[PDB]
Design a protein around this motif. Structure first.
Motif, PDB file in Angstrom:
ATOM      1  N   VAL B  34       0.816  -1.209   0.000  1.00  0.00           N
ATOM      2  CA  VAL B  34       0.000   0.000   0.000  1.00  0.00           C
ATOM      3  C   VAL B  34       0.853   1.263   0.000  1.00  0.00           C
ATOM      4  CG1 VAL B  34      -0.176   0.306   2.494  1.00  0.00           C
ATOM      5  CG2 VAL B  34      -2.114   0.936   1.017  1.00  0.00           C
ATOM      6  N   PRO B  41      -2.485   6.762   0.332  1.00  0.00           N
ATOM      7  CA  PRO B  41      -3.362   7.944   0.383  1.00  0.00           C
ATOM      8  C   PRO B  41      -2.639   9.269   0.226  1.00  0.00           C
ATOM      9  CG  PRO B  41      -4.040   6.378   2.039  1.00  0.00           C
ATOM     10  CD  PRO B  41      -2.782   5.813   1.427  1.00  0.00           C
ATOM     11  N   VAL B 174      -1.933  -5.401  -1.541  1.00  0.00           N
ATOM     12  CA  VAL B 174      -3.194  -4.750  -1.884  1.00  0.00           C
ATOM     13  C   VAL B 174      -4.052  -5.750  -2.650  1.00  0.00           C
ATOM     14  CG1 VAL B 174      -4.306  -2.914  -3.210  1.00  0.00           C
ATOM     15  CG2 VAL B 174      -2.214  -2.443  -1.908  1.00  0.00           C
ATOM     16  N   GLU B 189     -10.731  -1.982  -2.344  1.00  0.00           N
ATOM     17  CA  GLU B 189      -9.400  -2.531  -2.110  1.00  0.00           C
ATOM     18  C   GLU B 189      -9.095  -2.566  -0.613  1.00  0.00           C
ATOM     19  OE1 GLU B 189      -6.890  -0.148  -4.609  1.00  0.00           O
ATOM     20  OE2 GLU B 189      -7.292  -1.341  -6.413  1.00  0.00           O
ATOM     21  N   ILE B 190      -8.359  -3.601  -0.201  1.00  0.00           N
ATOM     22  CA  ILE B 190      -7.993  -3.834   1.194  1.00  0.00           C
ATOM     23  C   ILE B 190      -6.519  -4.224   1.240  1.00  0.00           C
ATOM     24  CG2 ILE B 190     -10.309  -4.520   1.917  1.00  0.00           C
ATOM     25  CD1 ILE B 190      -9.325  -7.472   1.708  1.00  0.00           C
TER      26      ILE B 190
HETATM   27  O1  LIG Z   1      -7.370   3.741   4.176  1.00  0.00           O
HETATM   28  C1  LIG Z   1      -7.049   2.858   3.185  1.00  0.00           C
HETATM   29  C2  LIG Z   1      -6.257   3.253   2.116  1.00  0.00           C
HETATM   30  C3  LIG Z   1      -5.894   2.335   1.147  1.00  0.00           C
HETATM   31  C4  LIG Z   1      -6.326   1.027   1.249  1.00  0.00           C
HETATM   32  I1  LIG Z   1      -5.695  -0.393  -0.161  1.00  0.00           I
HETATM   33  C5  LIG Z   1      -7.134   0.631   2.296  1.00  0.00           C
HETATM   34  C6  LIG Z   1      -7.494   1.547   3.267  1.00  0.00           C
END
Ligand SMILES: Oc1ccc(I)cc1
Ligand SMILES: Oc1ccc(I)cc1
Ligand SMILES: Oc1ccc(I)cc1
Ligand SMILES: Oc1ccc(I)cc1
Ligand SMILES: Oc1ccc(I)cc1
Ligand SMILES: Oc1ccc(I)cc1
Ligand SMILES: Oc1ccc(I)cc1
Ligand code: SF4
Ligand code: SF4
Ligand code: SF4
Ligand code: SF4
Lengths: 419, 445
Positions: B34, B41, B174, B189-190
């Motif tokens: 990530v 982010p 991811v 996405e997780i």
């Molecule tokens: O807060 C978040 C940001 C990216 C993802 I992949 C999951 C949660």
């Protein structure tokens, strides 16, 4: 490139036909027709032909063989050849991708993951910015080479070679039941805007003016092992290359503002399209023989309303050579290939009557596949046009996609030779 | 007289003794995927040309649309006409046909399945039992020859083998939950941990992606891009050779995983997921790390894509190669000077990451990859200027002095034409394709 220039014919389909010719139902091929479908395995059990062929592959592995009566170096080598063959088919559905508008062969791009990801750009929804057939022919051939074609040609679509009815499956049938639920479905041409499938028909628009034909070169060293397992492997890998070609090119055509129908082994007769598009000439064995690869090249094709300049058919003497050669007919293990002259009358239900060709018995050919545990290819391997043990192949020369740097220069392309 | 180029001789001359070439220290930890600029982010949101803040690839989309409408092939780069501008983006978009959400990074989803059991090809071949029969070959020497031959059939221009160094496997991938359809993937996405356990086969649970402790080796493939198209960087045709090669990577992974499975072993595909391809490529001997951060190869320079497959198949690791890249990068700096975002450092290598996007604890040139990504919406493409200007990307670097091969130091001192110019199958160049010919002698020693 200037060789191919030397052999351009004047415009006009070179396939001679009579008033008896009718479009051909796909179910009549030996692969699919009930009269040819079931064949015994080596134990005497009658099964779908490809399942009996599977039984022979298993028996050969356990007995350390690469083919019929052909001892491998050891069981490990025998296993490796079949593993490579099986893997080659990864991007192909049920041996040839013939079901139209199923799995990889979708007639519209709208549901594909790549189309969805690109939807905000709207390339598939935007009217075309280029309608000039000359520029389009150059663009789409460049794209075709990026997409893995070693040869590419364009022809007007002759509906005589489009199957009258396709072999397919019901749209909601899951893959695991596909082989048990194959059906026939008419392919018709109508005044509609886009290629469309109803419950009853596969509908190609009357605007579908053109067909783009690709040659996908097989590997010579591997094909020379026919009928043994490494010939099966180069066959199989090229089927997955065909599938990627069709999808890549259809998407390009769609993102240019036109529609595009993929086909691989479905929809129509590839050899006839390839001859009309100038890739090569029809032959005794029945394949399209090309100057670059002889018959040792696979074919796929894409149908489109994109304006294009048709290529010229070529005549580099294949018909007169096959007249006296007869080498494929003498070495064919099943005596499927005729030593006689060309006629308009088919030997059996598997031939389309009404066109002048060498008429071969394709049920005899298929009968050799369960016997030998492979896809034969001896006719391709012995043909003089294909020119210039298995352990030595595995230990020998290879390069990317099985292409050969000693010859790869011959398929280089500039605009001058694209349009 | 001029000695004919011998790529195999070159690799033999510069082969080094066994051992991972990457220098690390104690602050090294596995890197959560990530953190890449594509996903994190802090870097994920970029403005479009109207100043609207969006996911970066959506802002890039807006710039592609604007360029087509204005008849441009790239930033301030007028096309021959609108039709040409449109053709370049159509080719780029089509290239991605066999790739999910720009890189196939979700493990064990879509094309990247960790087992072959559900694939249509496996089902069709099930009566032969190739995936259920124990291996008939366990000798790593023969296996290395078989799998490298298969790799070339599967579209690799370069192939190499290394022992798997877990430092380069992402600590967490991811991905998306298994019940999420494609239409919602980008919104769902997780992160999911990648762990190594005493299990017989690669397996995914609700909480972890589990790689077996027996997963000894990684096979690394180089997928050559097209020189003429990449030299149009940052314009649309460089995007197209990038895109087509991502679909070639996907096919490679699936082809090779199926071959390995049909040989009686397991295989994990990855493309841009699972781990850091540059480090694997360096350890497998495809090339050396560079100032720009890419793996530079003798045959293609950095103008080559990477994918990799993980397996328990016994194999012979290749030797790393040292053909002087580090020393040329120390004095060259062309990519740093030409980079439109100033993302590439002109300074020394360090162990300290520039920002969250770098994995600290390994000696490398530390670049600011948020600056790089920021230029993609501005230019409407995937840039590539660093690849395009690198002297190793040009195809005449190598000379022979009568005793040995060496780099020619002299090297370090438009789009209509591309559409109208030279092309060949898959964009490969027949003037250099002899360089990747392979015999058993160069597959296994
Ligand atoms: O807060 C978040 C940001 C990216 C993802 I992949 C999951 C949660
Ligand atoms: O062309 C083909 C089709 C099916 C099979 I099984 C082999 C070759
Ligand atoms: O009768 C049969 C049996 C198997 C299959 I596959 C098709 C028809
Ligand atoms: O009997 C049969 C079998 C398959 C098909 I397709 C049509 C008729
Ligand atoms: O390598 C990459 C990844 C994503 C994109 I969008 C372009 C190039
Ligand atoms: O009846 C069957 C069994 C296996 C397969 I592969 C296809 C049809
Ligand atoms: O269309 C969209 C919107 C948000 C995202 I995250 C991806 C695609
Ligand atoms: S082997 Fe001879 S007769 Fe048969 S297709 Fe080839 S050239 Fe023609
Ligand atoms: S594939 Fe084999 S059996 Fe079939 S026609 Fe050719 S030589 Fe004869
Ligand atoms: S441009 Fe120069 S400094 Fe940058 S990666 Fe290439 S050789 Fe190294
Ligand atoms: S891709 Fe472009 S912006 Fe990114 S590091 Fe290379 S030159 Fe700089």
């Amino acid at each position: 490139a200037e060789i191919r220039q030397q052999f351009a014919m004047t415009a006009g389909s070179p396939i001679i036909v009579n008033d008896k010719l009718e479009r051909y139902a796909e179910v009549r091929t030996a692969f699919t027709h009930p009269t040819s479908f079931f064949k015994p395995n080596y134990k005497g059990e009658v099964k779908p032909w490809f399942l009996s062929a599977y039984d022979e592959k298993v028996r050969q592995i356990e007995n350390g063989e690469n083919g019929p009566k052909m001892k491998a170096k050891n069981v490990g080598e025998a296993r490796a050849g079949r593993a490579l063959e099986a893997a080659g088919w990864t991007l192909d559905i049920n041996y040839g991708n013939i079901y139209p508008n199923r799995f990889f062969m979708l007639w519209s791009g709208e549901t594909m993951t790549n189309t969805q990801l690109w939807a905000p750009v709207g390339l598939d929804r935007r009217p075309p910015d280029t309608t000039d057939p000359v520029e389009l022919t150059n663009y789409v051939k460049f794209a075709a080479r990026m997409a893995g074609a070693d040869l590419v040609g364009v022809a007007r679509l002759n509906r005589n070679w489009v199957y009258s009815e396709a072999v397919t499956i019901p749209a909601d049938v899951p893959y695991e039941q596909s082989l048990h639920k194959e059906i026939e479905k008419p392919i018709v041409f109508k005044d509609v805007p886009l290629p469309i499938e109803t419950d009853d028909e596969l509908i190609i628009p009357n605007t579908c003016e053109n067909v783009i034909v690709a040659g996908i070169a097989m590997n010579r060293e591997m094909m020379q092992t026919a009928p043994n397992s490494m010939a099966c492997a180069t066959t199989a890998f090229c089927y997955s290359r065909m599938c990627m070609f069709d999808m890549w090119l259809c998407q390009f055509i769609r993102y240019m503002g036109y529609y595009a129908i993929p086909s691989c082994n479905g929809v129509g007769q590839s050899v006839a399209f390839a001859v009309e598009a100038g890739l090569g000439q029809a032959s005794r064995m029945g394949a399209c023989i090309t100057p670059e690869f002889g018959p040792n090249v696979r074919l796929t094709k894409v149908f489109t309303n994109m304006p294009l300049v048709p290529d010229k058919p070529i005549d580099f003497g294949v018909t007169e050579f096959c007249e006296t050669c007869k080498k494929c007919a003498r070495e064919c293990p099943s005596k499927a290939i005729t030593e006689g002259p060309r006629t308009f009358e088919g030997r059996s239900i598997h031939n389309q009557s009404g066109k002048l060709q060498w008429q071969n018995d394709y049920n005899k050919c298929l009968g050799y596949w369960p016997e030998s545990g492979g896809y034969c290819g001896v006719c391709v391997a012995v043909c003089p046009f294909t020119k210039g043990n298995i352990t030595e192949v595995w230990d020998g020369k290879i390069n990317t996609y099985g292409l050969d740097a000693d010859h790869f220069r011959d398929t280089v392309s500039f605009r001058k030779d694209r349009v």
